[PDB]
Design a protein around this ligand. Structure first.
Ligand SMILES: O=C1N2C=C(c3ccc(O)cc3)N=C(Cc3ccccc3)C2=N[C@@]1(Cc1ccc(O)cc1)OO
Length: 197
């Protein structure tokens, strides 16, 4: 949406209702039994036993992806064999967003970039660090985070695509920094409304 030389927004906007609504939407989504809590075991079950198995990851790809998911949700305060409720979750996410943006400001790779690298190694069949529209539909619909083809098309329309019409991990990482962490207006619309704003 801003080209490849766009400088990431590095400050936070945690009291913005759009930020709150994005994470409340995801919390309710992840709270599969609607009991008001989630844990890391559930996140990793989803990641390894559903997403990686169905999308054809090798055992080693699955292991790498799982460590990235552990680290990402662990950075928001989730733990194995311990349950997390919404107020705790959203406070933990303020801490995650802050430490991720701080990492980026210091040229240290982010947990969300490491996750993207691990996921794209599985779902990018050509191997150049970018995914086609059909690969992105398959991932997002298996994860459940997008549910219609039009939402995925909106993601591709929003993002700046490479020469081959594909979504590169560096672009999706920049978009994620602005969508999940800093509330950057230029990243609004990233999930085509499947996740709000
Ligand atoms: O970003 C992504 N996600 C963010 C959250 C999420 C969850 C809770 C929040 O409060 C905020 C965000 N949940 C899921 C889906 C998922 C959840 C749990 C386990 C596996 C997958 C998810 N899938 C990703 C994976 C991804 C990562 C980097 C990329 O470059 C491209 C794709 O793309 O959409």
């Amino acid at each position: 949406s801003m080209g490849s030389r766009y400088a990431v927004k590095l400050d936070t906007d945690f009291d913005n209702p759009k930020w709150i609504a994005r994470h409340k939407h995801m919390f309710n989504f992840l709270d599969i039994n609607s009991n008001g809590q989630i844990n890391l075991n559930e996140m990793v079950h989803k990641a390894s036993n559903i997403i990686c198995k169905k999308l054809g990851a090798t055992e080693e790809q699955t292991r790498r992806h799982q460590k990235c998911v552990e680290d990402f949700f662990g950075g928001a305060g989730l733990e194995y064999d311990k349950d997390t409720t919404w107020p705790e979750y959203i406070e933990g996410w303020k801490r995650l967003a802050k430490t991720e943006l701080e990492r980026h400001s210091k040229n240290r790779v982010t947990l969300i970039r490491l996750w993207g690298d691990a996921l794209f190694d599985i779902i990018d069949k050509d191997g150049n660090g970018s995914v086609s529209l059909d690969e992105w539909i398959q991932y997002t619909h298996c994860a459940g985070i997008q549910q219609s083809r039009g939402q995925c098309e909106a993601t591709f329309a929003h993002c700046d695509l490479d020469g081959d019409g594909k979504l590169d991990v560096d672009e999706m990482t920049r978009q994620h920094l602005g969508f999940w962490y800093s509330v950057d207006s230029t990243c609004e619309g990233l999930y085509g409304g499947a996740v709000p704003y």
